[PDB]
Amino acid sequence: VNYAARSVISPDPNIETNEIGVPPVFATKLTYPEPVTLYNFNEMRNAV
Amino acid sequence: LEAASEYVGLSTDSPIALLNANLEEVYRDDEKLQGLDAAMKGKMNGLT
Amino acid sequence: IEYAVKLRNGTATEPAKVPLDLEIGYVPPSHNGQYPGLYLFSNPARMVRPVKHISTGELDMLGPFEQVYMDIACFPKEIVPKVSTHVEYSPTNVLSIVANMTPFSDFNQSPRNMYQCQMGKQTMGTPGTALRYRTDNKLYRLQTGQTPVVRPKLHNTYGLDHYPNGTNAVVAVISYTGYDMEDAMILNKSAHERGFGYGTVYKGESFDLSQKRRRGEPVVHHFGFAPGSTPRREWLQKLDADGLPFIGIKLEDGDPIVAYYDESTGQNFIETYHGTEPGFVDEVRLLGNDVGDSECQQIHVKLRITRSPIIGDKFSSRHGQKGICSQKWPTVDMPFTESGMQPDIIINPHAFPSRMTIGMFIESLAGKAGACHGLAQDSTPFIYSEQQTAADYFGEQLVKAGYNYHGNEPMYSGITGQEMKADIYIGVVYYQRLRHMVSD
Amino acid sequence: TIRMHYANCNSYNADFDGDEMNMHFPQSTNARSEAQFIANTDSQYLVPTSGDPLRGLIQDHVVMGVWLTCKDTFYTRDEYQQLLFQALKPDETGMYGRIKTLPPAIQRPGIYWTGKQIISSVLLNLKPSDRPGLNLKSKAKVPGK
Amino acid sequence: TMIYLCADCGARNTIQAKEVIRCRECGHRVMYKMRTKRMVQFEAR
Amino acid sequence: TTVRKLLPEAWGFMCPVHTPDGSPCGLLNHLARKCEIVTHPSDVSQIPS
Amino acid sequence: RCHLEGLSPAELIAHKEESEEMGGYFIVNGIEKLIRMLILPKRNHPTAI
Amino acid sequence: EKIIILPGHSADLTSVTFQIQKEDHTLGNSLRYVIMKNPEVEFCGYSIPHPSEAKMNFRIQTAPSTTAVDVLRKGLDDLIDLCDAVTEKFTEQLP
Amino acid sequence: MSFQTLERERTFKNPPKDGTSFPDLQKAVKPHVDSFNALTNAGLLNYAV
Amino acid sequence: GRRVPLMVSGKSLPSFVPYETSAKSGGFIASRFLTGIAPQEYYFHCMAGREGLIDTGYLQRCLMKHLEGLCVQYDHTVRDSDGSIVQFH
Amino acid sequence: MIIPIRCFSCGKVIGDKWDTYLTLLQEDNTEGEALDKLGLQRYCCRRMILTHVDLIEKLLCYNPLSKQ
Amino acid sequence: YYFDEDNIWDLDKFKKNLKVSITSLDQETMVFEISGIDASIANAFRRILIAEIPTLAFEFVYIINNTSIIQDEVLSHRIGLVPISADPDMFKWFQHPLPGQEATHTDYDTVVFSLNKKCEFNKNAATDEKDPKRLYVNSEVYSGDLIWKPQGRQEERFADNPIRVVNPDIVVAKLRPGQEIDLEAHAILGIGQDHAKFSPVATASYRLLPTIHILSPIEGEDAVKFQKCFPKGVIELEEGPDGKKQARVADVRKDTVSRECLRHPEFADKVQLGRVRDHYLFSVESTGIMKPDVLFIKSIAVLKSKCLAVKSSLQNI
Ligand SMILES: [Zn+2]
Ligand SMILES: [Zn+2]
C-alpha cells in the first residue's frame, strides 16, 4: 500500500490515550490531499 | 518416605531391602509410577 | 587411579597398565533391568569428565555409562559412608562456560538463566584485540568496557579479562520517570554523553572486478581513473586519484566509494555505498590477486559506523533483564542520594516479580559493596548456604562501608526537591549493551 | 521513535521491546471520517469476545493508585493544586476554561486535602455539562483484611 | 605514484597504477593504503 | 516431547541451563565446563592379560 | 599442520593474530568455517531398540 | 516569544494560562512556590507539555479583586527579592 | 578474590613468550585441534588407506 | 505432569542412592530463591523450566471464508449476503 | 580503550588518575583501597578506575607501520 | 479557596528567618548550610549549578592528520570532555550557523587550542622494557599538550590570566612509533543542559540536615552497640555518675541516614530518625573552571536573570 510508514514504538505517558506521537520526520514524509476552500485557504497558503 | 511406603503397602518401619525390592518392581511399569507420583505429590503439596 | 597418580608425578611413565580414559561400566543384574554384563570401553570420541575418588584422594575419569550406576556425592558434606564412592570436585563443574559466568546464577528462575545465556551470547562486546587485521563483514566493538565488580572466579580463570562485555551501571530500582514500563528503562543523559556504552560497528565490504569479466576477453577493468576527465562534483572529493577512497573521509548514503574503468570504452564506472548510515573509512586493502604477477583486482574497504545509545537499543543485565533505552532523562531531573550520584540507569521495580531475578537484587547489593572497599565480590554458584545467606554477608560488607544494610538509600527527587518518602534501592549492576538493534 | 501511551499496550499485545507497528494514513476524507468516528481508539474500550474491557492502566499507575487513595495520605494546598493540574492539563486537550476544586477534608489546625479527594476532584472536573455525578459500589482488588 | 604499506614488512612501496602488486622487499601480496594529510572536522559530541 | 527433554544422564557432561530458546530448544546442548572428549586411544592388551 | 603450533603469545603478536588465539577453524574463502560436533550412538556396544 | 497567553484565558483575564518559552522545572517550581504565598490566588500549578520541547504551561486563577497578570508580576518581583536576600546573606558570610 | 590488575597490566604490556597465560581456553577448544592432530599423527589416515 | 524421570538404575540423579524415597529426590526442592537453591535441586529446576520453554494460523481462513458477509440486515434478521437467513434476531 | 575521563555518574575528571593509581598497587603494597589516597569519596567515580580494563596497551602492539 | 493565613509572603519575616553558614570553603570543594528555604528554591539553586550556568568547552575539532589507533570521533569526543580554564563571562555566545554556515567564527566567540605529536622510536633504550614510557617518546598524548593559540586581540585580553587546560595531566590518547595525531580544537560557550562537558561543577547536591533523638535512655552494652552503629563522632556515650553509660547525639551533621540502628529489634523502640524540614546542607564540588563561591553566586544570579527575563517580556504584553 501507498502512504504507510513502519517503525519501532516506544512508550510515553504524557500524550493521551488516543494520540500517537510521530517525529517531525513522519510529519514531513506522510502527506494527504486536501482541496482548498475559502476558510482553510490561510492554512494551505502558509503550508505551501 | 511415609507417602511412598503407604502407597506400596508397607509400613514406615519396614526393612530397607523389601521396600527396595517392591520399589524396583514398581517403576519398571508406568501406571504404578502414575499412582506413586500422584500420592507423593499430594503429600508434598499438602506440606507446601 | 593408583597407577595414574604414579604416572603423573615422578615415578616412571611406562605404557599405562590401564589408562584413565578407560571406563569400567559395571551393569548390575536385576529383573526387568538393563542387560547385565561388565563393559570395558577403550574407544575414542567419548565423553569423559573428572571426579575425585573418595577412598583414595586423587582424580578419576568417568563417562556416561558409569554415571547411572555410581553414587557421586555432590559435596564433601553430602557423602554417606559405605555407598558414596565418588565426590564431585565442585558442583560448578556441571554448568557450561558461558552459563557459569552469571553471578548468583542459582538465585534466578532457571528460564531467566537460559535467556541470559542465549542473550549474553549476543552482546556488543570486544570481539578480540586484533581488529586491524580482520576481514569480517560486520564486527561490533565496545569503546568503554570494564570487568564486572561481581564476578565468578572462573571469569578470571577462563581469561575473560581480555574481552570485556559491558560496563558497571549505577542502577536504581525505582518507578519515577514513568517511561519505564513494559520492561523499558531510562539512561541518565549526562551519564550517556560522558561515554556510556558506545558502540562502533565495522562493515568491511569487498569489491572484485574479476566477476564483471564474463568470458571472451582478457583482463580489462582496472582500479583508477581513465586517462582523461574525472568529475569533480563527487568523485574527486572522496576518491584520492587511484579510485580508492580517502582514509578517514566521512561518507553518506549516496556517495561513491571506488572507481574503475574499462579498457575498450575507456569510461570510468563507479560503485556507491549502499548502506543508509553515515560511515567513515578506516582501512582499504589492495588484495594482490594471487601468488604474483597480477594487478590489484580486489579491494577491501572497512567502514567504521558509529552507534551511540539511541532510543531503542537493548540493554540487558546478566540475569535476562533486557530493556530498551526509553527516553534518556536529563541528569538534572534524576533522583540522587545524600551523596549526589545520579543513578546511571533507572530500572523498573515492577519487572522483578513474575521474573524472580532476585539474583539481580543480590548482585546490586554485592556491587555496591565491592565497589566501596575495592573487592572483586566472589559470586560462584552454590557457595552460600541456608545457614548464613549471601544477602547477610554483603549486608555486613555494606554496614561496614556505611550504607544501609538492606541496600536501600535515601534519595531526593529532582523535579520537586523534597525527599522521597520511601528509601530506594541503588546498586552497581553490570550492564552489557545488546546489539539486536542493528536492523531497526 | 513514534510514541504511544501504555493503555494500548494491552490491546496491541505489544511489549515495547522491539516489535514494530505499521502506521497507515487514510487518504480520502471519507476514510478519515470513518476512522475518527467508527474505529477510533477510545471507542475500542470493550473486546468483542466478552464484555470485559481491555484498555486500562498498568503496573506503575495501579500500585501508585493503592498508595494514593489509601487513607493515611494527606496533602497541603500546594501539592493538591499542583498534582491536580498535572493530572488535568487542560490546554493541551482543551474544552474547559477554569479548574474547580473541593473544600478540604480537614481544616484545622492545618488545612489538608486527602487523596480520595483528589480522585473525586478529577472526576468533578471531567463531569459533562449536565449529567449528575457518578455513584457506585464495587469490590476492590486489595482484600479488606 | 601512490605510497602504500606492505602488510608484513611495513615498507613504503611506491607502486603505480596498473602494475604488479607485491612487496618490493619481502614479496608479500597485501597492501594497505596510508592515511594522508586532509582536513576533517567532527563536533565534540 | 522426546529427546528435546533434559533426561538426566548429563550431570556434568552437557549443560542443563545453557541452550537456546525457541524452536531449537533442547537440541544443541553445549558441553559442560570440564567435560573432555577422549580422542587418543591407547593399547589395552594388558586388560585381557 | 599450521605454522602457529607451539608458538607463544608474543610470537603471535609478532604475527597478526591476537595473543590468546584458539584455533579449531578451517579458513575457507576467509570466513572461519568449523565442523560442529554431532551426537551418535555408542561405539560397538550392542544396544536394544 | 518568551511568554504568551494561551487561548483558554477568561475574558476578565482572571483564569489565564501563560506559556513560558524555553524553561523547565527550574523556574516553574520556584515561581509556583512564591506565587502560592500570595493570598489572592485560588490556583497555581505548572506543567510541561512534553519534555522533548522546552515549553512550560503555567496557570494562575485569582479572586475577582485583582487580575492574574498583576499576580504574576508581583510573584516574579517577590522571587527576585528572595534571590537577592539569599545572595546578600551568602556574600556577607565569607570575607 | 581481587581484580588481577598488576598481573593484567604486566601481561598486556610485555606479552608472555613462555606459554599462553590462559590454559583453560585451550583445554576448551582441545577437542577439535586434538582430533586433527589424531588425523595426521597416531596413524589415522594410514589405517584408512 | 507427574515428576522427575527416573533413569535406568532407578536413582533420580547420580547424587542419590537407588530407589531413593526422600522427597528431595522426587523433585521437591525446599530452598527459596532468596536464600539459594542447591545443585541437586537446581538440576530439577532446569528440567522444569526448559520443559516450559519447549512447551511455549489456518483456523482464521476456515471460519472467515464462510462467514465473510453474515451481516445483520435492516429487517434485523442476520442473513448471509447471498440472501439466505441464518438467524432471526 | 583508555581510561574513561569524566566518570559517568559523577562529573569528576579521572582521566589523569590511572598512571598514578597503578603505581600504587605496583610498588606500594597497598590494596584496592589505594584509590582512597586518590580522593574518590563516592562509589560511582570509584568503580571506574577500580575495575578498569585498560585494553589499549594490548591493542597498540599491532602498528601496521612497524617497519619490521 | 483556603490559604492558611500563615503561608503568607513577608520578605522582612523571611530574611529574618533565613540564616546561612559556610562550613568549609576550598579551591575545589565547598560545603555550606542554608536555612529557611523551601525545597523549591534550594532545588532551583542545585538545578542551575549543575546545568544552567555557562562554561567554555571544546565543541569543534579539526583534525589534519590522525593515524593513531584511537578512532577519529572517539578522539574528538575524548578531547571534548576535557576542561578549560577561562572566565566564561568575558565572551559572547556562538550564533550557530544556519545555511550559509562556513564563515561564522570570530575572536570574541571562540578559543583555539592545538596539539601535534608524532611518537618517534626512542633509541637510547637499553633492553626490552615495554613500559612503554621509556621505550618511546611522546608515547601518551596528554591534555597538557593542548597548546593555546590566541586569535588576535585575545592575546592581550587574557595576558594577566592565561587560558589553559585546567588539568594538564589527563591522558588524551596513546601513540607508538610511527603514528601521529594532529588537530586543533575550537571551544565555544555552552549551557549544561545541552551537553555534559559544559557543566562546571563535578557534583552539586544537598541533604536535609538529619535529626536523631533518643526517646528513652539506653545503658551499657546497648550504649556501646548504639555508638558503634552510626559513623564515628555523631554518638557520644554519656559520662553519667548516676547509672553507667548513656548515649547523646553529639553532631548529626556527620551522620549518613543509613538507618542502621532501626535494624536491631530492641533499638527500634528507643530512637526516631527524622529530618529538620527547612535546613538544607549544600555540597558543591566544581571541576576546574571557577572557585565554588563564584559557582553559587553565579547560580543565584542566573536565577534572577531568568526571572527578570520573564518579567520584562510580560511587561510587553
Ligand atoms: Zn613485505
Ligand atoms: Zn562519578
Curated annotation (Swiss-Prot), chain G:
Role description: DNA-dependent RNA polymerase catalyzes the transcription of DNA into RNA using the four ribonucleoside triphosphates as substrates. Second largest core component of RNA polymerase I which synthesizes ribosomal RNA precursors. Proposed to contribute to the polymerase catalytic activity and forms the polymerase active center together with the largest subunit. Pol I is composed of mobile elements and RPA2 is part of the core element with the central large cleft and probably a clamp element that moves to open and close the cleft.
Designated gene of the protein: rpa2
Superkingdom of origin: Eukaryota
Location relative to the cell: Nucleus, Nucleolus
Oligomer and partners: Component of the RNA polymerase I (Pol I) complex consisting of 14 subunits.
Family: Belongs to the RNA polymerase beta chain family.
Name of the protein this chain belongs to: Probable DNA-directed RNA polymerase I subunit RPA2
From Swiss-Prot, chain H:
Primary site of residence: nucleus
GO BP of this protein: transcription by RNA polymerase I; transcription by RNA polymerase III; transcription elongation by RNA polymerase I
Domain of life: Eukaryota
Subcellular location: Nucleus
GO molecular function, one term: DNA binding
Family statement drawn from the similarity comment of this UniProt entry: Belongs to the archaeal Rpo11/eukaryotic RPB11/RPC19 RNA polymerase subunit family.
The protein's role, per its UniProt record: DNA-dependent RNA polymerase catalyzes the transcription of DNA into RNA using the four ribonucleoside triphosphates as substrates. Common core component of RNA polymerases I and III which synthesize ribosomal RNA precursors and small RNAs, such as 5S rRNA and tRNAs, respectively.
Protein name: DNA-directed RNA polymerases I and III subunit RPAC2
Gene, per the UniProt record: rpc19
From Swiss-Prot, chain K:
Pfam families xref list: RNA_pol_N
Alphabetical UniProt keywords: DNA-directed RNA polymerase, Metal-binding, Nucleus, Transcription, Zinc
GO MF term (any one): DNA-directed RNA polymerase activity
A GO term from the CC aspect: cytosol
InterPro entries: RNA_pol_su_RPB10, RNA_pol_suN_Zn-BS, RPABC5/Rpb10
Highest taxon above the source species: Eukaryota
Principal subcellular localisation of the protein: nucleus
Keyword Kinase annotated: no
Binding site for Zn(2+): C7, C10, C44, C45
Chain ranges passing through the membrane: none
Purpose: DNA-dependent RNA polymerase catalyzes the transcription of DNA into RNA using the four ribonucleoside triphosphates as substrates. Common component of RNA polymerases I, II and III which synthesize ribosomal RNA precursors, mRNA precursors and many functional non-coding RNAs, and a small RNAs, such as 5S rRNA and tRNAs, respectively. Pol II is the central component of the basal RNA polymerase II transcription machinery. Pols are composed of mobile elements that move relative to each other. In Pol II, RBP10 is part of the core element with the central large cleft.
Entry's family note: Belongs to the archaeal Rpo10/eukaryotic RPB10 RNA polymerase subunit family.
Assembly information from the UniProt record: Component of the RNA polymerase I (Pol I), RNA polymerase II (Pol II) and RNA polymerase III (Pol III) complexes consisting of 14, 12 and 17 subunits, respectively.
Protein's recorded name: DNA-directed RNA polymerases I, II, and III subunit RPABC5
Annotated source species: Schizosaccharomyces pombe (strain 972 / ATCC 24843) (Fission yeast)
From Swiss-Prot, chain L:
Keywords attached to this entry: DNA-directed RNA polymerase, Nucleotidyltransferase, Nucleus, Transcription, Transferase
Molecular function, one GO term: DNA-directed RNA polymerase activity
Subcellular location: Nucleus
InterPro entries xrefs: DNA-dir_RNA_pol_30-40kDasu_CS, DNA-dir_RNA_pol_insert, DNA-dir_RNA_pol_RpoA/D/Rpb3, RBP11-like, RNAP_Rpo3/Rpb3/RPAC1, RNAPI/III_AC40, RNApol_insert_sf, Rpo3/RPB3_RNA_Pol_subunit
SUPFAM superfamilies xrefs: Insert subdomain of RNA polymerase alpha subunit (SSF56553), RBP11-like subunits of RNA polymerase (SSF55257)
GO cellular component, one term: cytosol
TM ranges: none
Record carries keyword Nucleotidyltransferase: yes
Main location: nucleus
Keyword flag Nucleotidyltransferase: yes
Role, per record: DNA-dependent RNA polymerase catalyzes the transcription of DNA into RNA using the four ribonucleoside triphosphates as substrates. Common component of RNA polymerases I and III which synthesize ribosomal RNA precursors and small RNAs, such as 5S rRNA and tRNAs, respectively. RPAC1 is part of the Pol core element with the central large cleft and probably a clamp element that moves to open and close the cleft.
HAMAP family named among the record's database cross-references: RNApol_arch_Rpo3 (MF_00320)
Known partners and oligomeric status: Component of the RNA polymerase I (Pol I) and RNA polymerase III (Pol III) complexes consisting of at least 13 and 17 subunits, respectively. Interacts with RPAC19/RPAC2.
Family that this chain belongs to: Belongs to the archaeal Rpo3/eukaryotic RPB3 RNA polymerase subunit family.
Protein's name according to its UniProt entry: DNA-directed RNA polymerases I and III subunit RPAC1
